[PDB]
Enzyme design. Structure first.
Site, short mmCIF file in Angstrom:
data_model
loop_
_atom_site.label_atom_id
_atom_site.label_comp_id
_atom_site.label_asym_id
_atom_site.label_seq_id
_atom_site.Cartn_x
_atom_site.Cartn_y
_atom_site.Cartn_z
N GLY A 27 0.83 -1.20 0.00
CA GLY A 27 0.00 0.00 0.00
C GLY A 27 0.86 1.25 0.00
N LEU A 28 0.45 2.21 -0.83
CA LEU A 28 1.19 3.44 -1.07
C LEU A 28 0.24 4.60 -0.78
CD1 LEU A 28 0.70 1.68 -4.06
CD2 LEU A 28 3.17 2.19 -4.19
N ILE A 30 -1.86 7.27 2.44
CA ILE A 30 -1.79 8.52 3.24
C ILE A 30 -0.44 8.87 3.93
CG2 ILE A 30 -4.28 9.07 3.45
CD1 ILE A 30 -4.22 7.40 6.19
N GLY A 32 3.05 7.46 4.90
CA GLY A 32 3.99 6.38 4.59
C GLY A 32 3.47 5.20 3.77
N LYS A 33 4.31 4.18 3.70
CA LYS A 33 4.14 3.04 2.81
C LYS A 33 3.44 1.92 3.58
CE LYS A 33 8.71 5.01 2.72
NZ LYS A 33 10.12 4.93 3.24
N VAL A 34 3.14 0.81 2.91
CA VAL A 34 2.71 -0.39 3.62
C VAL A 34 3.62 -1.56 3.28
CG1 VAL A 34 0.81 -1.89 4.24
CG2 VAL A 34 0.39 0.45 3.62
N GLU A 95 -3.71 -7.71 8.90
CA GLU A 95 -3.71 -8.88 8.04
C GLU A 95 -3.41 -8.51 6.62
OE1 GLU A 95 -8.31 -9.97 8.63
OE2 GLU A 95 -7.53 -10.92 6.80
N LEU A 97 -3.48 -8.87 2.77
CA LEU A 97 -4.55 -9.25 1.86
C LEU A 97 -4.05 -9.27 0.41
CD1 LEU A 97 -7.07 -6.99 3.69
CD2 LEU A 97 -7.14 -9.51 3.75
N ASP A 142 -14.68 6.90 3.75
CA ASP A 142 -13.64 6.74 2.74
C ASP A 142 -13.71 5.44 1.96
OD1 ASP A 142 -10.12 6.68 2.34
OD2 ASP A 142 -11.38 8.35 1.72
O1 LIG Z 1 -5.10 1.56 6.10
C1 LIG Z 1 -4.59 1.66 4.99
N1 LIG Z 1 -4.24 2.84 4.34
C2 LIG Z 1 -3.30 2.91 3.24
C3 LIG Z 1 -3.58 1.89 2.16
C4 LIG Z 1 -3.76 0.65 2.89
N2 LIG Z 1 -3.49 -0.61 2.43
C5 LIG Z 1 -3.75 -1.54 3.40
C6 LIG Z 1 -3.54 -2.98 3.32
C7 LIG Z 1 -4.04 -3.73 4.36
C8 LIG Z 1 -3.88 -5.09 4.34
N3 LIG Z 1 -3.26 -5.74 3.35
C9 LIG Z 1 -2.77 -5.00 2.35
C10 LIG Z 1 -2.14 -5.83 1.34
C11 LIG Z 1 -1.49 -6.98 1.73
C12 LIG Z 1 -0.91 -7.82 0.80
C13 LIG Z 1 -0.97 -7.52 -0.54
C14 LIG Z 1 -1.61 -6.37 -0.95
C15 LIG Z 1 -2.19 -5.55 -0.01
F1 LIG Z 1 -2.80 -4.46 -0.45
C16 LIG Z 1 -2.88 -3.63 2.30
C17 LIG Z 1 -4.21 -0.84 4.49
C18 LIG Z 1 -4.23 0.54 4.18
#
Ligand SMILES: O=C1NCCc2[nH]c(-c3ccnc(-c4ccccc4F)c3)cc21
Length: 282
Positions: A27-28, A30, A32-34, A95, A97, A142
């Site tokens: 995730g890219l 708000i 920072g990154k994920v 978790e 996803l 959102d």
């Molecule tokens: O809360 C958030 N804001 C920013 C964007 C954001 N993204 C996530 C998120 C959550 C769980 N898992 C994933 C993920 C996991 C594996 C592969 C691909 C995925 F997107 C992505 C959460 C949030």
């Protein structure tokens, strides 16, 4: 006879003790990154959001927590307040996803095309999630289709809802309606492959909107009401047949899959306008 769950717990020791962090991003969004992350004990893969840790976030999580206890809402697994840059930080581990943005899964369906019944099931689920939140006095504010992703890549696989960077407690014109609007928006795009288009009339093109029961064209209406009010409450939303039917919906073919293959370019556009419509909306 009596059951509760773990209260929220701000783990203080460096997350690098309990996990090994990658730099591989997901995730890219708000703040920072994920990053993908692996659990030292169990050895499973995880989503890691990271936060500045100001009073604000400190409740945003504090809610996400309450919400994870849901099926179609993403589960938080661990929340750490460590020190990154020099900044009392905030690492939420949730978790992973491996599904892909709700829609970006459908244009790789591979077999057949889409179905009014399948559209329901999706919307149907998403409905539930919103319920919970409302059912506990929470507005997500959102409900974008980036914020919808699936657990895995199988058609059994289910989808959940993320990014409470926007959620808000409906505590002590309004709010828990934004989430509705979205669903409406979501349903539209679900059926055809586009939204409205402003910054309000929504036309219903022919090779798309045709023998498509006004029964369904009804919903979309009530939901999309440029209004804050008579935007059909979720409680309400659930009540109407189509949704609450699981399987009694027409098997009508849907072009949406193909449609989205038509114009892959209109997306980076869609996304912003979707956030435009949202985010700002009070
Ligand atoms: O809360 C958030 N804001 C920013 C964007 C954001 N993204 C996530 C998120 C959550 C769980 N898992 C994933 C993920 C996991 C594996 C592969 C691909 C995925 F997107 C992505 C959460 C949030």
């Amino acid at each position: 006879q009596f059951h509760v769950k773990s209260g929220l717990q701000i783990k203080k020791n460096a997350i690098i003790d309990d996990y090994k962090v990658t730099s591989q991003v997901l995730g890219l969004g708000i703040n920072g990154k994920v990053l993908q992350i692996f659990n030292k004990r169990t050895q499973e893969k995880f989503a890691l959001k990271m936060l500045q840790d100001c009073p604000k976030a400190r409740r945003e999580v504090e809610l996400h927590w309450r919400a994870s206890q849901c099926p179609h809402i993403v589960r938080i697994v661990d929340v750490y307040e460590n020190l990154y840059a020099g900044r009392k930080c905030l690492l939420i581990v949730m978790e992973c996803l491996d599904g892909g943005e709700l829609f970006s899964r459908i244009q790789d369906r591979g077999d057949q095309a889409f179905t009014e019944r399948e559209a329901s099931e999706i919307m149907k689920s998403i409905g539930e999630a919103i319920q919970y939140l409302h059912s506990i006095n929470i507005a997500h504010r959102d409900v974008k289709p980036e914020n919808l992703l699936y657990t895995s890549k199988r058609p059994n696989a289910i989808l959940k809802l993320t990014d409470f960077g926007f959620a808000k407690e409906t505590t002590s014109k309004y709010d828990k309606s934004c989430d509705m609007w979205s669903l409406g928006v979501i349903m539209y795009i679900l059926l055809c492959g586009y939204p409205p288009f402003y910054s309000g009339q929504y036309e219903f093109p022919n090779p798309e909107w045709s023998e498509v029961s006004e029964e369904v064209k009804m919903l979309i209406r009530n939901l999309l009401k440029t209004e804050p009010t008579q935007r059909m409450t979720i409680t309400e939303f659930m009540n109407h047949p189509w949704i609450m039917q699981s399987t009694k919906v027409p098997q009508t073919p849907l072009h949406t899959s193909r449609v989205l293959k038509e114009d892959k370019e209109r997306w980076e556009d869609v996304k912003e306008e979707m956030t435009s419509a949202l985010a700002t909306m009070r």
